[PDB]
């Protein structure tokens, strides 16, 4: 019920053409420019719906999923032809967050599952790597094709017949990891710096380079303890970015 | 308890000062003035601080400069033996105790430690320096700041500290040319700078003039 109401509110937010809105023109430009990411100002959403903005800031994952679903529905309604190419769209955020504008030094557990904005410098970057989404396999012995989705790699048929992988039919997405360090111009003198880890996916992979000053908006989450009968009770925290800006 | 009474009785002696002066360095022949100055340094004075603005120290630093073969190191060894808290070091190098503070993993204990210089370890004690003219820039700067400000400031590996270094410094040195020249001043005969020399309260000059009777007595001893 809550998710459906949030989706309804998000759908109502976008239909602003009869209210001097700009987002319809933005979506038209995105379709024209073959882009699948939309940037929405947090200030405008707060002006139009403060409760939805508060819920999104205090709870990110579910609200972001609902907003992506709403954007999918909106793009479908505009031109379902374009929506066929991509499975889902992605959301970008902009504006003044206020209390959630947090430097790497001031990041704490109080901001878990929330949307935060950080400003820093890039020190470490990793090579771009593909990640599997779907897999297609073929059996020359029986001329049968099987499909698998990911969110175990099959190797043999039911009758132990060998399976051959079709790399071209599979789906891959880009992935990269970067590190952000507090700017020395603002860090206290005589103290060691503190760093945060950020994950970039899809079209945001190649938007950062080491030695550059950037501003990143994204969700703050923990990583669960890996498999084992005993756990230390300490989880690593990694930022999942949704928008990167060159200041 | 009886020791206090014995000390008070000894103080009533009319020649207690001469006895104390002659007691220092029994194995060293001659150099009465050096022994007297070392006694004065050992007994020390009294620091003063009107309010929290004007600080005046009470430590008596001693510098000895002399020709080779005048037994300068024996006085330092005797002072190290006598003093309850005495730290001995040499400026040549490979000293057991360093003169500059640093943060490092100890080779033996394998633990992350902050090791201060000999000046800090000698707080309210005595610091003896041999080969005072062989020191490098870091040791000279550390000694200068420990003698002027009586404190050491450390800013290393994210650690910012200030440590007290209230100590009495006794140093030994040799002339630039290997032999003291009376025609030149003391400053021109030593590789040290004037501000460093100005810190020492007592400066002693030792020469190796050929006196047959003194040489005969020294050889007999
Ligand atoms: N007045 C003295 N009485 C007894 N021994 C003496 C006297 N003067 C010098 N010596 C002897 O001279 C020797 C020289 O060694 P010593 O370490 O004392 O020299 P030093 O003056 O420190 O020399 P250097 O300039 O090379 O550092 C010693 O074995 C010491 O016993
Ligand atoms: Mg010597």
Q: According to the entry, how was the structure determined? A: cryo-EM
User: What SS3 state is found at A131?
Assistant: strand
Instruction: Name residues whose C-beta falls within 8 Å of residue A52's C-beta, 6 or more positions apart in sequence.
Output: A6, A9, A10, A13, A45, A63
Dist CA B130 CA B88 (whole Å): 8
Query: CA-CA distance, B221 to B29, in Å (whole number)?
Result: 8
Note whether A123 and A182 are within 8 A (CB).
Answer: no
CA B77 to ligand 2 centroid distance, Å: 10
DSSP A105: G
Q: Is the CB of B107 under 6 A from ligand 1?
A: no
Resolution (A): 3.2
Interface test with B, best of A105, A182, A184, A190 (most B CBs within 10 A): A190
Q: Would the annotation count B73 as a binding residue? A: yes
Question: Is the sign of the CA dihedral B197, B203, B205, B206 positive or negative?
Answer: negative
Distance B72 CA to ligand 2 centre (A): 6
Residues 6+ apart with CB under 8 A from A86: A36
> Are the C-beta atoms of residues A215 and A232 closer than 8 Å to each other?
no
**CA dihedral defined by B22, B26, B31, B37, rounded to 10 degrees?**
-60
* Centroid of ligand 1 to alpha carbon of B18 (angstroms): 25
Residues measured by CB to lie within 5 Å of ligand 2, the ion: B 73
Q: Which chain A residues are within 8 Å of B160, Cβ to Cβ?
A: 190
Compute the distance between CA of residue B51 and CA of residue A20 in angstroms, rounded to an integer: 73
Determine whether B155 is exposed, middle or buried from the number of CB atoms within 10 Å of its CB (0-12, 13-18, 19+). exposed
Q: Let me know: does B37 contact B202? Beta carbons within 8 Å.
A: yes
The half-sphere exposure of A83 on its side-chain side, counting CA atoms within 13 A, is 16
- The token pair that represents B99 in the structure block: 């003169």
- Please give the C-alpha separations between residue B212 and each of B27, B66, B181, B207, in angstroms, as whole numbers: 20, 20, 21, 15
Closest approach of B147 to chain A, Cα-based (Å): 25
For tokens 């039911």, the residue is A158
| Structure token pair of residue B167 | 């100590």
- Nearest residue (CA) to ligand 1, atom 7: B71
CB A182 within 8 A of CB A104: yes
Residue nearest to atom 28 of ligand 1 (CA): B71
Look up tokens 């400000």; give the residue: B149
Assess contact for A155 and A163: CB atoms under 8 A.
yes
Q: HSE-up of B150 (CA within 13 Å, CB side)?
A: 14
Q: What separation in Å is there between the alpha carbon of B86 and the centre of ligand 1?
A: 21
Alpha helices (H) in A126-247, listed in sequence order:
none
* Nearest ligand to residue B68 Cα: 1
d(Cα B57, Cα B47) in Å, to the nearest integer? 5
Report the alpha-carbon distance of residue B210 to residue B10 in Å, rounded. Answer: 39
Query: B35 CB under 6 A from ligand 1?
Result: no
CB within 8 Å of A165: residues ≥ 6 apart: A135, A136, A137, A138
Distances (CA, A) of A195 to A105, A125, A179, B160: 8, 13, 7, 21
Q: Would you say the CB of residue B32 lies under 6 angstroms from ligand 1?
A: no
Phi/psi at A204 (5° precision):
-95, 5
For B:160-219, CB contacts with A below 8 A are 160
B142 assigned binding-site residue: no
**Taken in order A178, A182, A184, A190, is the CA torsion positive or negative?**
negative
Backbone angles phi, psi at A37, to 5 degrees: -140, 135
* Contact list, A192 vs chain B (CB under 8 Å): 158
Residues in A 179-198 with any Cβ partner in B closer than 8 A: 190-192
A175: nearest Cα among A127, A103, A229, A225? A127
Give the residue, out of B30, B31, B70, with the most ligand 1 atoms within 8 A of its beta carbon, to mutate for a pocket test. B70
Q: Could you give the C-alpha distances from A190 to A104, B152, B163, B164, in angstroms and in order? A: 17, 16, 17, 20
Question: E strands within B43-195?
Answer: 62-66, 86-90, 102-105, 112-115, 125-130, 151-156, 159-164, 167-173
Please give the C-alpha separations between residue A196 and each of A178, A211, A239, B114, B151, in angstroms, as whole numbers.
Answer: 9, 15, 7, 29, 38
Residue position matching structure tokens 């190419």:
A85
* CB hemisphere CA count around A104 (13 angstroms): 25
Burial class (CB in 10 A: 0-12, 13-18, 19+), A106: exposed
């Amino acid at each position: 019920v809550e998710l459906r109401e949030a989706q309804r509110d998000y759908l109502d937010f976008l239909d602003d053409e009869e209210d001097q809105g700009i987002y319809q023109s933005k979506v038209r430009e995105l379709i024209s420019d073959n882009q699948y990411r939309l940037i929405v100002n947090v200030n405008d959403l707060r002006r139009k719906n403060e409760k939805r903005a508060n819920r999104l800031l205090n709870n990110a994952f579910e609200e972001l999923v609902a907003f992506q679903r709403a954007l999918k529905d909106f793009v479908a309604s505009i031109d379902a032809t374009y929506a066929k190419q991509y499975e889902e769209f992605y959301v970008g955020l902009e504006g003044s967050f206020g209390s959630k504008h947090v430097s790497p030094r001031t990041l704490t557990s109080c901001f878990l599952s929330c949307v935060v904005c950080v400003e820093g410098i890039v020190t470490k970057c990793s090579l771009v790597r593909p990640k599997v989404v779907r897999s297609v396999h073929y059996c020359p012995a029986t001329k049968k094709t099987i499909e698998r989705r990911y969110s175990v790699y099959p190797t043999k048929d039911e009758e132990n017949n060998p399976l051959e992988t079709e790399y071209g039919l599979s789906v891959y997405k880009d992935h990269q990891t970067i590190t952000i360090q507090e700017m020395p111009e603002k860090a206290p003198a005589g103290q060691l710096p503190r760093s945060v880890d950020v994950i970039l996916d899809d079209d945001l992979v190649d938007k950062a380079k080491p030695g550059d000053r950037v501003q990143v908006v994204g969700t703050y989450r923990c990583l669960p303890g890996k498999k084992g009968g005993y756990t230390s009770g300490t989880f690593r925290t990694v930022l999942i970015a949704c928008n990167v800006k060159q200041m | 308890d009886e020791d206090v009474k014995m000390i008070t009785s000894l103080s009533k002696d009319q020649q207690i000062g001469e006895k104390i002066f002659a007691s220092i360095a029994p194995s060293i022949y001659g150099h009465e003035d050096i022994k007297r100055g070392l006694a004065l340094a050992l007994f020390g004075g009294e620091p003063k601080n009107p309010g929290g603005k004007h600080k005046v120290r009470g430590d008596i630093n001693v510098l000895l400069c002399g020709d080779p073969g005048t037994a300068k190191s024996q006085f330092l060894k005797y002072i190290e033996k006598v003093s309850s808290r005495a730290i001995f070091t040499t400026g040549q190098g490979a000293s057991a105790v360093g003169l500059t503070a640093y943060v490092q993993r100890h080779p033996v204990s394998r633990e992350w430690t902050l090791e201060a210089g000999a000046l800090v370890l000698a707080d309210r004690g005595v610091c003896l320096i041999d080969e005072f003219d062989k020191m490098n820039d870091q040791d000279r700067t550390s000694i200068h700041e420990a003698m002027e400000q009586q404190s050491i400031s450390i800013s290393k590996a994210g650690i910012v500290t200030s440590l007290q270094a209230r100590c009495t410094v006794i140093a030994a040195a040799n002339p630039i040319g290997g032999r003291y020249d009376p025609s030149l001043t003391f400053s021109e005969n030593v590789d040290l700078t004037e501000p460093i020399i100005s810190r020492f309260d007592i400066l002693c000059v030792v020469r190796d003039t050929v006196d047959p009777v003194q040489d005969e007595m020294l050889a007999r001893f």
